[PDB]
Design a binder for this molecule. Structure first.
Ligand SMILES: CCCCCCCC(=O)c1cc(OC)c(OC)c(OC)c1CC(=O)OCC
Ligand SMILES: CCCCCCCC(=O)c1cc(OC)c(OC)c(OC)c1CC(=O)OCC
Ligand code: NA
Lengths: 239, 237
């Protein structure tokens, strides 16, 4: 149970690596003593980790009941506008901040110190958020709704903002009755307002992502892939 | 007119572009403010912008005083000014500041404590004060600095209509600087100074990032000419 809750759960679990398909062939806890200060390699990896999730988040979104029923312009705006947030949220939930382990959606496992030069201090902020997310001890169905709710949310330029809002309300309702379905002791709506407290912090983290990309576009060692670029420019709110 | 003529003009342009020890404005200064670090409100951001704008109006009038500059084409004067503004704002602020006391001293005469700049400027201001210490330790005298800042401005820029008249004027100020440093008694102070250029370069980048961040945040609109400088400098636009 139940039918919305189970589709979400399935779309979530299907959009990422099983425990058995994790790839450690690249993971090095020891690296340094060095920097890039930015090397091409760092930057090209940063961007490749980013692009990797694109196709994955896009197929995940399609399995959300109702998402395929929004206008195609609305589907593309939600996806573009939520991309960085979904990338951070899913990374944060997937990773293991106690050990400094980042686990990407391909299955690829990397150490923080392997990510540092590419992501800059951003990786540290993501890790902090992941530490905080972990201690909320959020279950899979709660997570399945939370990420869906990051995607399905009001955005400037929506064609059918009311239909996006009814789809979001179904999801929030599903969430609310699921975290109340674990009743004793909590049943609180404290659990709830704590998990929902994680969305603004996420938006703040996304801004830090846009900051890193601005910085890398500035130095121009290696251009972003056009779809990341398009999201950067389509979502920077300023002729 | 008819001592030291180009040099005299440079010094005189320099000195009239900034405050006398007597004209320092302690009216907003507080030796201790307790800021909420990492965040900023509209008065913070507006002061940051005003500080940038007033600096550019002042750099404009100083430039009008460099012999030859005001006879460059209008578009050339604009382009030189817009292209060097961040460099000049950082170099001039660091040169007159008092980092041993956490004091930023702007061209208008406004004195502000590092703590007071934290919210508008973010980390950038701390890094500018590092460059102040770095600059101050080279003991660049005022006539050397008059020539140096002027050479930051007068330099090749892509899109000049009259690049050779700019290079002609660049040659004039270099010969002028050389005469001066030879009149005041290998890898030289200038070589040493050129060695600080990467610091200045990074501080300009850090300025461009702070402005990006604040535009993203959008508490208040930026001044048009500052916004145009930010936008013109982006190599991807
Ligand atoms: C390489 C750095 C060495 C340390 C010197 C620091 C610069 C300085 O405080 C200074 C000292 C002067 O007197 C010697 C002077 O001329 C009157 C001068 O120009 C206005 C300045 C510069 C200035 O920007 O102040 C105006 C408010
Ligand atoms: C044209 C593309 C060049 C990109 C390089 C970084 C641009 C920058 O930081 C900058 C931007 C400006 O305008 C935004 C500007 O004038 C205010 C300025 O003063 C020299 C600098 C400083 C500078 O160019 O030297 C250190 C980097
Ligand atoms: Na992902």
């Amino acid at each position: 149970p139940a039918n919305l809750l189970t589709s979400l759960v399935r779309a979530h679990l299907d959009s990422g690596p099983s425990t058995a398909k994790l790839d450690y062939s690249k993971f090095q806890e020891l690296v340094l003593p060095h920097f890039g200060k930015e090397d091409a390699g760092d930057v090209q990896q940063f961007y490749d980790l980013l692009s990797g999730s694109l196709e994955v988040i896009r197929k995940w979104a399609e399995k959300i009941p109702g998402f395929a029923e929004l206008s195609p312009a609305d589907q593309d705006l939600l996806l573009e506008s939520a991309f960085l947030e979904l990338f951070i949220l899913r990374l944060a939930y997937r990773s293991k901040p106690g050990e400094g382990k980042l686990i990407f959606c391909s299955g690829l496992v990397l150490h923080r110190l392997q990510c540092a030069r590419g992501f800059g201090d951003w990786i540290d902020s993501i890790l902090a958020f992941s530490r905080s997310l972990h201690s909320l001890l959020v279950d899979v169905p709660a997570f399945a709704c939370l990420s869906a709710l990051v995607l399905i949310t009001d955005r400037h330029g929506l064609q059918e903002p009311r239909r996006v809002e009814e789809l979001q309300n179904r999801i929030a309702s599903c969430l609310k009755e699921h975290v109340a379905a674990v009743a004793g002791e909590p049943q609180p709506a404290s659990c709830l307002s704590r998990l929902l407290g994680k969305l603004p912090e996420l938006r703040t983290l996304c801004t830090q992502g846009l900051q890193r990309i601005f910085y890398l576009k500035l130095e121009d060692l290696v251009p972003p892939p056009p779809i990341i670029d398009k999201i950067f420019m389509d979502t920077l709110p300023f002729e």
